[PDB]
Design a protein around this ligand. Sequence first.
Ligand code: NAD
Ligand code: CU4
Lengths: 492, 492, 492, 492
Amino acid sequence: PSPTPNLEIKYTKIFINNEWQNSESGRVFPVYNPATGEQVCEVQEADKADIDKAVQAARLAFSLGSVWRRMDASERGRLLDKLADLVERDRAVLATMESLNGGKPFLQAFYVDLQGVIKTFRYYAGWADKIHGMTIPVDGDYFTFTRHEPIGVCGQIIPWNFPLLMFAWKIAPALCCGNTVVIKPAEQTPLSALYMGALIKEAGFPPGVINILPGYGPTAGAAIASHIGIDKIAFTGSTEVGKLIQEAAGRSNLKRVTLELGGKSPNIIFADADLDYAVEQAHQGVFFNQGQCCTAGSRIFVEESIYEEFVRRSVERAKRRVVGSPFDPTTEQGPQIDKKQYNKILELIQSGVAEGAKLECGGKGLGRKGFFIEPTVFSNVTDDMRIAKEEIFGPVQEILRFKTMDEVIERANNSDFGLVAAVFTNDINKALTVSSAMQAGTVWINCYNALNAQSPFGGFKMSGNGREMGEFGLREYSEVKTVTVKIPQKNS
Amino acid sequence: PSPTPNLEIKYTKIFINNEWQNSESGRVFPVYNPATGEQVCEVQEADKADIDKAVQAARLAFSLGSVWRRMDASERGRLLDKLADLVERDRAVLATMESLNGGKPFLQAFYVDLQGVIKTFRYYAGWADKIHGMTIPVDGDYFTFTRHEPIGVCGQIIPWNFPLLMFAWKIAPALCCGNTVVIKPAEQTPLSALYMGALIKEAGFPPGVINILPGYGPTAGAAIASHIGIDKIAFTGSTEVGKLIQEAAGRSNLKRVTLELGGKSPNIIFADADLDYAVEQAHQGVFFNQGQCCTAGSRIFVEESIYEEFVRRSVERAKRRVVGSPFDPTTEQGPQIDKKQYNKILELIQSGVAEGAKLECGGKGLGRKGFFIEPTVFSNVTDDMRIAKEEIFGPVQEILRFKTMDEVIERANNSDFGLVAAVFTNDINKALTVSSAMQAGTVWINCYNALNAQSPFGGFKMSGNGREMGEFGLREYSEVKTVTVKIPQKNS
Amino acid sequence: PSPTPNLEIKYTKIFINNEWQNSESGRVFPVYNPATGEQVCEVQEADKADIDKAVQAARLAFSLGSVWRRMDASERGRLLDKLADLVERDRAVLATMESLNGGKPFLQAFYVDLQGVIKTFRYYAGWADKIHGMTIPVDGDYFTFTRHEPIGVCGQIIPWNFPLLMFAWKIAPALCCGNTVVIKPAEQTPLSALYMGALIKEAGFPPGVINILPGYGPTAGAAIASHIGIDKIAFTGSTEVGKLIQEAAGRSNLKRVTLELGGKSPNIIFADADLDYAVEQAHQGVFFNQGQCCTAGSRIFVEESIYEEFVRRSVERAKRRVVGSPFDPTTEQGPQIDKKQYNKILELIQSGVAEGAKLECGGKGLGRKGFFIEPTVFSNVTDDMRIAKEEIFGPVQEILRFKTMDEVIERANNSDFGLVAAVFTNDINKALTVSSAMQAGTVWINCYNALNAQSPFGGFKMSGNGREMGEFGLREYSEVKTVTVKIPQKNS
Amino acid sequence: PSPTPNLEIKYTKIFINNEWQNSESGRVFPVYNPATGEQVCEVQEADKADIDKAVQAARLAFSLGSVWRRMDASERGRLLDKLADLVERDRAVLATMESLNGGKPFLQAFYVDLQGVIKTFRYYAGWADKIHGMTIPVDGDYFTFTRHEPIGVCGQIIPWNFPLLMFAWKIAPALCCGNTVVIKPAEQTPLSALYMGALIKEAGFPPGVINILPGYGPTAGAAIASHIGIDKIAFTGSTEVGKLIQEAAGRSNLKRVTLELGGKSPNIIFADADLDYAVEQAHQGVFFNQGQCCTAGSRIFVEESIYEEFVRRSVERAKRRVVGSPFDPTTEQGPQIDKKQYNKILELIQSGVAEGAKLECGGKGLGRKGFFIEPTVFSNVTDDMRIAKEEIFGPVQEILRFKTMDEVIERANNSDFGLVAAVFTNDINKALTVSSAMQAGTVWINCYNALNAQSPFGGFKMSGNGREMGEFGLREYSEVKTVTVKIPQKNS
Ligand SMILES: NC(=O)c1ccc[n+]([C@@H]2O[C@H](COP(=O)([O-])OP(=O)(O)OC[C@H]3O[C@@H](n4cnc5c(N)ncnc54)[C@H](O)[C@@H]3O)[C@@H](O)[C@H]2O)c1
Ligand SMILES: CS(=O)(=O)c1ccc(-c2nn(-c3ccc(C#N)cc3)cc2C(=O)Nc2cccc(F)c2)cc1
């Protein structure tokens, strides 16, 4: 497939009540291409006043007796399935927009990101008419049952590293349960989300069920967090903004909260593993999506006996990583999202040598035709150094040493984060022991970054509150109501 | 059954690591009998230092390879089952302790509160080895499964209206899932929980699994809520404090939060209801436990056809209610918990009269000692009155009239709260339409109020976050870890 | 829509391994149009040799590493959803094939039968990748999980009264779980099932996953029931043949068996019901599908106060029911399936008049072409009559009379059958008491033949084994495998 | 613990309606000690007349409105909890009965058999009030929920190899779901079951809920399997008799059938496994309970490289196995159950010698009295040999050679049986490939004969129909009733 050539950006306005509207203040804000630096377009900037309109529209579409409430649960799924069909029809345009806006290689935006979006809508389309309550054999002459009702108006805030994918991961389970949504994409990458607005309207979704409001964090996002008319907020982003999100809920209307926060997730290679396979997977586990992942390997604990040739094979392939333009079919890695992320990544690369790390290859040195950075491999890293404790979100791979299994479990777990973790080995005892000992939400064995629409995903500890994906992602978007009926006499 | 004659309070110390300790500061605080105002005993006052010692003991009991972590899940249930046997053996002592400390009539504490405690422990004893994960058929060559593991150290804060029952509601699901507990009972009523510590040690729970720290809210409670070594907080209490808990959790260590906050629960009576039965059930809905239930049917809506007779019957029933000493088997209504509650109820009663409501009976304090209040009935109450919008945790009944089902549905839902609701009718269509339309976590039909170990209990809107009781109470105390293994072929 | 004129029957051969084949013997059998009595076409007759070829093809399509076994579960679902798209495409063709072969009014076949077929495939298309096993916290140092695997080759035998819907209800959950199918449609109505094989081929199911073999009962069916290479048989039909089915399973393979057998289902109407609504619901409860529903409410119990009035409206509606050609848009009732069924009905109608029952209308045939029977209403029926104890698969409505609730529960439950029951009342107490006291797998309250793609069926006592539809229909088509892995220590 | 001194057999009568009855014919049958051939006692022999009295008592106890049907689900669990306490109190007496009557070593009965009995009753005690139905979001204005009710009278027939444990596995899930039971223990071993009748009465079960009828297969057993008033039969577990059970059920009243039939279970030892550990677990997998487990165990496939060393170590262990009196604390292996089994094993041992297998050890009977057989090991066994097929319910080990995993999977699966499989390896890929490929209801990895109350147990193919143990064991003893209520509006 090919990136669609002269791609007009047709949708740049605010999406409220299935209508395109200008910002209340009149302001707009620029969207940028990270592969050059040229401004792509300008998008209407939502602020608090725009959020108040989106919430009023979402509340009306959720009122009792509305089109969205009375709709058969199975027809909720048919709409989600039809959204997947429209995305598949415009898969090239959407993937082109994702390479243009986020700087991802087009061929993996087409075959990875867009596939996960299509599969997510298809997967949750089947769940809509399969969300069950229960009947309970209760004491006394009573008949007790539960209903899994939708919570209501849901505010959703998503980052920039997977704009279209995170958009699907948020609205698909929310709409599957019958909620209405006010979602605010990252200010850096709002375009694919806004294009989804036209697909949502084309699919047949009732007005006000999904409202897309592009804007900045402290303005439009903080308006969502403290809004008294939003029943539930789903936030995916940094830990510190997550603490603000949690505080805003308790301060305002005690809205229900889930936070996906990521962390410094370990990657454990053992001597038993196939080195050719472990090198490539731990490479993709940290370098994929220009390293801007929280599942990112970052730390790579390698056993004593294989540490040397592991680094040898890492830098070997890390030097063939074809950096270049996203629209080029040869490009493996595109540029970072913006300058500030392109900057504070290089502070930490300079911090690596400033604390004593054998910088093998890497260090940054690409023609500034964009926001590109040279693939970097550090070694002789220790738990003390700053590059081991804070996340990088860049093509920086840090390799460490370990001897005992018991020492690598403590070293991997000694972290207030804990989103994911990986183990590479063929011993079944050590694979089961390490996986069961990890304080992380997802543990991969002999693989990395293997996400699926069917499997729940979330973080332990401070990285954080809640679960997404799979069936368990639906519990986040449902409210349990118990009904107890007095009956003349109970039997059975 | 009779009250324990010369009830000595044997356990007045802080319970950490299965050992009775004095407070780090040496302070004690008094405990009073609300029926006479006399001081019953003094109890060691836990503060921040004692909380810190409890958390480190609870954390040590939860570390890998400990007795509580290595113990069979079925053996966790054996311990909860043994605890229920000990509560059953000392049922009269604990009921007398609840009556003397809390003012509940002894027969009600024996047959209602103590029965709920025993059935709660026996219920969750059976859940321990039945908490199941799932295996998921993901795309590709993968074997994906999930584990449901304990959260960690759980901080628990409970109020004074059902001291022993709230104690069991909190620790039973937490222990069932394998966590450890630091629990702070209300400063008004710490005696039942301290006696449970002795039963906890007698049953054979490992040291540090349950730690009980009697103390005050701003000192002991706030230290629990802001502790960075506590993974999860479960709070039951006022909405104003509940806001401070969710806030302090976000700015500290992003601990998971459970809130049970209650509300202003409506009770709808249609003309096609067993009038004599509805009068009695709505009478118990307000007056049970001295009106100090969050499920209190504060606003009783009556259809206009039966309004005058329902008022006349409710007033006669309220004039017959026996207020007196809790130890007297004739007593139906004990005192309020303290002078703070007593004063806030008397002021609200004054507000109802000043705003035009018809004081049908009562409205004044009873006697000179204790905190007894006359059973009070207000008629002609409208939605805008203060007594109709504010929670009166006291023996005050409020009767409002309505005309149509759609009118009473909007009025009953018009509330920041949504904990509980009830409808009394013999029409199946009215019963199902109203129960489906209520914005409340529990809806009762022709009853008030059937709670049970099997039925989930929570609230909509600002009445709480999450659920207690039943299977769904377990989900608050487990965290999901997803494990994905790369496999050679996969055969579906 | 309109019936496709001069419909050409194109598929008349045996469908094995996605190939149309002739009989191994060469024999063929005729298919008739029961509205005009003459021959539609000729269809290949499958026998033991042909079933053997089907089983061998189904066994190969299920072997390890095959396309069907290696297929992602979500891709099994998209195949089922493509099949629903195709059925929707040829909807008017299949409805015309169902009116022509089965005598159903075309609009009823279009808007009811095929609406259920499409929704059934779409519903089970969503279940394919959501069949979850479980992980269990067993005692000892063990990790235990379960896999829900397909059983294997499933033999399926269906009757003639809902040929396309029966076909869908059988293969949809079977394919959803990953099984392969050898299905034998009723010899009276094999056409629409054979057309499905063309849609199966077009949708892209692997060869041999579905094998459709038209033939006769004691030949093709008995070969299926006794075949040693078939893992599970699913039979829907008469009770007597069902006894032969389970005997063959025990005599041969110990294959898993589920049966869907007769009904003689009671319909209970109380005086407080809306008589206009109940008269029509209980009228469709008997007369729908020419009275040839196992769920027929052939025992209408009416409260004494409304009996003679209920009889009058039931009589007036019966004489108004338009009987005629199914292709005619004004036709409500078509003909019976064949001559054998036509004779048994009249021999039971004459059984009622030879005994005490009062014949209010109809009672005889209509002409010569087709097997049309007048809409018939019997009054004053008692439990002793043959007409109240034997299943009448015709348009014969019997109206009994009762006085008390305890009486009608006793009379309704007095039956070796127990597939279905209905209650019409606005009182919640007698609705819940009667519905709980019924000995039937489905109880309808203030409705009747309201089946859905969700919600199980049948199926109590001698009326069935196991359940179809809903999630529980999947339980019949999976086998549990427990895997226990020894681990070093185990915690949590 | 030591065997009960002398031990009197006090309960030798038929247990019906909580009363001890004589046989209707007055006949008794002897019970023997298999270690000495001497007669222990005589027991009333139940026949068709006694079964009819038991079914009548079981039907009345199941009557609507009876104590057993009105009892809270939680109180059904309390009774199971009390029965476990009584079994624990009399653990030594029941262990001595199992040893004296069944031939098991006393310490094995005490620590293995009765531990399983106690844990089984305790496990299902917790399930009673946790059997949940579901509420279903169906299309249209409908409210649909399911109730899981007891089936009714459950006939149960169990074997002699694990008398008390089979008794608990049968009645615990049946009583947990609220059924009533008519159970026939094996004629060889009725003593433990009859003693349980005394504890059942002492625990406080209502009369007629459990009825224990000692007798023979063709008399008492065949009357149960063909009884018209029995709703469900659960059988265990000879395959030949299992065919008669499923056939008689279809011929009688189409009662529901669960079968737990035999097996020739493989044990696959790979080269990369702990050899000393695998030799011992494969030894116990064959020789435990005198080789009288259907979870044997017989066919041990060993990889070629370790074949001869595995064989030598297995012979060394077999020559050391201590055979002698069950009461002697040093005994590892008691006698066979009776002369019929004794002769059956010696016959098959001759078949192995005549067919060319290498008799490395054993092959003869031990002593002149009892039914002791030397621990016997066959090497150089091949698939075609008679001993490689055909269940040897005795202390006979057979060791087969293999290379390549694909070969051993095809050979281990080459069986009409499919109850159990095991694999010993440290490679996670081999362990997961084999366990997923095995056609068996239970696969063990690096262990054998684990088994717990929490994990379901059953057979593939002709090894059984359905599942016992775990949550899935409850699915066999419940009937799903769907209730659908038409509602006015319907919202999410
Ligand atoms: N499937 C399992 O879980 C399991 C467990 C243990 C043993 N077994 C099987 O038990 C068998 C050993 O005992 P067995 O050889 O005496 O088999 P068996 O079937 O003859 O004996 C078991 C029971 O079957 C009953 N029985 C015998 N004939 C009957 C008939 N015509 N009608 C009704 N009931 C009849 C008897 O009451 C007896 O108690 C082994 O073959 C083994 O496979 C199976
Ligand atoms: C063929 S069977 O289905 O009749 C059967 C019966 C018993 C066992 C068995 N065998 N062992 C065993 C123990 C030690 C050694 C050794 N060394 C070997 C075997 C333990 C068990 C067992 O069931 N435990 C158990 C525990 C708790 C609950 C419960 F319900 C059952 C295996 C198969």
